[PDB]
Design brief:
part of a larger assembly, 2 chains, mainly alpha, two-stranded parallel ribbon, globular, binds 2'-deoxyguanosine-5'-O-(1-thiotriphosphate), binds magnesium ion, binds manganese (II) ion, cobalt ion binding (chains A, B), single-stranded DNA binding (chains A, B), EC 3.1.5.1 (chains A, B)
């Protein structure tokens, strides 16, 4: 194509948008406003109580979702800074419309780095697991694939595929697949837009759209977009938002925002090393024990290896003249540094090298893919952590616990989803209903933000339409998932216990 | 010549320093390395468990020292960005040597903003309280002030003044005043240098030196520097470091680093607004209730000016329309914004206006001088919080609790300070001592980082010297304060309970 970042770095907003002209400084200020909105957001504060690798941890020295997101933000800064430095060295900065958008470029990366994870549920993957597994038993999306049933097994009478040829059956398929396909990424878009009503710039929202697969997607993903459509990137409830976002950022269907690959790279780069640091701190293994696990896990290599210049290098450096520090602290400092100094430049280069496809958002790979020795180093760290950190019984037990907690909470609120459309809308209208004490009482438990979202969405539906009862139930289930995913590891754990009368 | 920021923004280090020439990019990378060191520092991670206004808070929506420090960092960024923008308008950027140091200028501010609370003890003005009160009743610095004296209440036989006269008594005075003058700011310098061995750039360290008063200062004086010397800025244990730092940053005795004023301004601006937001969240009062409390200090002598421009503007903007925006959330959003838009420019201008004195580090005021209507707005927020947030029984209760906890821990470890020099050094040598089981076990409880610091310091002392026993006791007390101040609110609370055999 013709790479013009002015066409992608969009400073307009969905609501009460800044309009027309705006100087270099004026545009900077717009993006700086987004930083303030995001940093002061309770959604980001909530991260210091959301788990990363070690659940419900009471050691501050261990990373939370917030401290991790903060570290990712620095890797993202370094990558963005290096992309711009090279583009300036290639003279291509002015040529790519970036000469006046240097600051926004950097800031967008840094902020979408802090905001990846914003939509993650209480017990991470076990939160995703519990939510989807609970919904999957309720409405079976398995049965919605063909045209009849003859059973369907979907408990929801409205959502069963009657029968009895209907184009309305397509909505049922979409709704059933979408509700069983909760993803932190998809929930993130829902969160920043529909639920938090942060009025971020279009460019800032494009940065947190990591995947391009619609949650309701049922088939095999297109060969050309297999990677970008890896996981669901957005829900049915956002289809319209995503559609305006696509227009506002000049994105093709299922195409990604150009700055996302920067953020994505920064994410992989920082959790790997970090997770091993935390394991040593928890006392899962010693720094010497870790070094031996890494040496095992590596190809061999060793002759003309990256292992030598990175992990071996950090190991030797941390043995002596580490007397001016401490063996383990010194090791991780060098390991981080060496990894960054080799991977950040590669990522930066990779971005610039494949910039036409990346810009188009059609590029079907990550910045640090298979074929590179660089990519292999990252895989090494991941493999060691999988085999020796994640496999730890105390970690695994909390994962099992988390799953029980989330599943339990879903079952606790189940009666709200069990109510009839008329009875539920009666509960929505007259806040407290006489014949439904328990139901009204929970309904009140749901965060006002989440409840308004339901009201707002359902209000926009045409009541007369035969689609209406199906849409209402979709949004009612969405409301519930929003509440649950919204909670911290700790709040979910407490709420579950308080509502079981075991506290 | 005169204002030359090249002479203040020092990229050199204490240990293994980068040397000679360096590219604008190369220097950027040096300061970016500091970001990485600070962000990945466990000392910063520990902040997500240290308290800000509401102690041991179980709601993630309430700020911790880390989330607040993060917010200060953004205000600092905006102030830094505005100072540079205006200097660029004025054409003074090239003239002040800043043309090539734009990034470091901003980064140094941002980082010293994030690190501003690094040295704060658990609880934490109550930690300072408990630490100083505990030490004051052990070694009364009260009696050391005057000529010796004769019956000084100092329990420490060594540190007791003569009856009698000597110049070694001056060391006793210095040691007794210093140990009773713990201050988070002074502990921060100790932390980044002696304890964490971060090896930041000289400029980066100068940024966290908020006060220029030596902890041991006994003098009532000295007008000209009465503001800069408000609180202790460094301990006796870092007198030498501070001396090298003074040389490296071309600072006069008791003169401050030019960028500190920026960081300082951001911290005040941020805390006032955030604490009122948190109070509303903690349901201490409603947003309506808050508006009425503010509509008191006003002052309606204006009658339609700054209060009407900021807080009345935020109040009116919060009423009606919203668009899934809760009146509570949108009010604080506008209050913050309006405050920033009026105070950040003032601070930025104040800095530029008094730049000669601020550069020299002789400027005896903060950027928000009491005289300004701007300064008054900040006082309004503070006053509302003082008489309606900080006065809350639950807050006050935790404060009382915190004080008992810290005092308790100090009394728990008291036997280590009770040991003779020979016995304590025997304990330091043969890690385990048979004749001292409790003392042995307690010594082991102390952080290895902290323990090494004692060893390293005492090793450097000349054993033959009559100063040696006094210096050893100073470093022994320092070691203890290091341990205690090092803990989070939670760790201190747990440790106290575990060591009371009540857990
Ligand atoms: N405890 C634990 N058990 C596990 O089995 C496990 N697997 C991974 N991790 C943690 C360690 C890391 O902190 C974290 C990264 O999360 P993610 O899997 S969301 O990674 P992305 O790059 O975001 O892929 P995506 O597109 O899906 O977002 O996974 C785990 N932690
Ligand atoms: N609950 C409570 N009770 C109190 O009595 C109190 N007093 C203040 N605060 C809290 C509210 C604020 O969030 C916090 C500010 O801390 P600070 O700024 S004082 O610390 P430094 O970095 O040393 O700068 P400086 O020394 O010049 O003040 O104090 C309090 N909080
Ligand atoms: Mg202050
Ligand atoms: Mn991540
Ligand atoms: Mn503060």
């Amino acid at each position: 194509a013709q790479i013009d970042f002015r066409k992608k770095i969009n400073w307009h907003r969905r609501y009460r948008s800044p309009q027309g002209v705006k100087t270099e400084h004026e545009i900077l200020r717009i993006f700086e406003s987004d930083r303030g909105r995001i940093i002061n957001s309770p959604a980001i504060r909530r991260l210091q109580q959301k788990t990363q690798v070690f659940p419900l941890e009471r050691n501050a020295a261990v990373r939370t979702r917030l401290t991790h997101s903060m570290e990712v933000q620095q890797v993202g800064r370094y990558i963005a800074k290096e992309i711009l430095s090279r583009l300036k060295e290639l003279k291509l900065l002015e040529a790519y419309g970036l000469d006046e958008l240097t600051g926004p470029f950097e800031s967008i990366v840094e902020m979408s780095c802090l905001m990846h994870d914003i939509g993650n549920p209480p017990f991470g993957h076990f939160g995703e697991a519990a939510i989807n597994d609970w919904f999957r038993q309720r409405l079976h999306p398995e049965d919605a694939e063909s045209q009849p049933l003859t059973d369907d097994r979907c408990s929801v009478a409205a959502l069963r595929l009657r029968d009895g040829e209907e184009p309305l059956n397509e909505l049922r398929r979409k709704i059933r697949q979408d509700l069983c396909h909760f993803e932190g990424n998809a929930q993130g878009i829902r969160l920043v837009h529909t639920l938090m009503r942060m009025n971020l710039t279009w460019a800032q929202v494009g940065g947190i759209l990591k995947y391009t697969r619609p949650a309701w997607w049922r088939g095999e993903t297109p060969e050309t977009h297999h990677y970008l459509m890896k996981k669901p990137g957005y829900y049915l409830s956002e289809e319209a938002y995503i559609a305006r976002l696509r227009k506002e950022l000049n994105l093709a269907l299922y195409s990604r925002f150009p700055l996302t690959w920067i953020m994505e790279a920064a994410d992989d780069i920082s959790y790997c090393v970090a997770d091993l640091e935390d394991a040593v701190e928890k006392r899962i293994f010693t720094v010497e024990q870790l070094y031996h696990h890494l040496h095992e896990a590596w190809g061999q290599h060793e002759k003309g290896s990256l292992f030598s210049l990175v992990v071996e290098n950090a190991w030797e450096k941390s043995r002596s003249n580490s007397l001016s520090r401490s063996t383990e602290d010194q090791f991780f400092m060098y390991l981080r540094v060496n990894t960054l100094n080799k991977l950040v430049p590669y990522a930066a280069q990779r971005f610039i090298d494949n910039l036409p496809a990346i810009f188009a958002g059609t590029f079907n790979h990550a910045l640090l893919e298979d074929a590179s020795e660089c990519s292999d180093l990252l895989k090494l760290y991941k493999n060691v952590a999988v085999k020796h950190v994640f496999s730890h019984p105390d970690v695994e037990r909390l994962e099992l616990q988390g799953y029980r907690v989330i599943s339990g909470l879903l079952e606790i609120y189940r009666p709200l989803l069990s109510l009839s459309l008329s009875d539920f809308t009666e509960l929505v209208e007259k806040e407290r209903v006489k014949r439904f004490p328990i139901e009204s009482r929970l309904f009140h438990k749901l965060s006002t933000r989440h409840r308004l979202a339901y009201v707002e969405a359902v209000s926009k539906l045409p009541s007369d339409s035969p689609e209406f009862p199906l849409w209402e139930y979709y949004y009612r289930c969405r409301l519930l998932q929003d509440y649950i995913s919204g909670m911290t590891d700790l709040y979910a754990w407490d709420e579950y216990r308080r509502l079981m009368a075991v506290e």
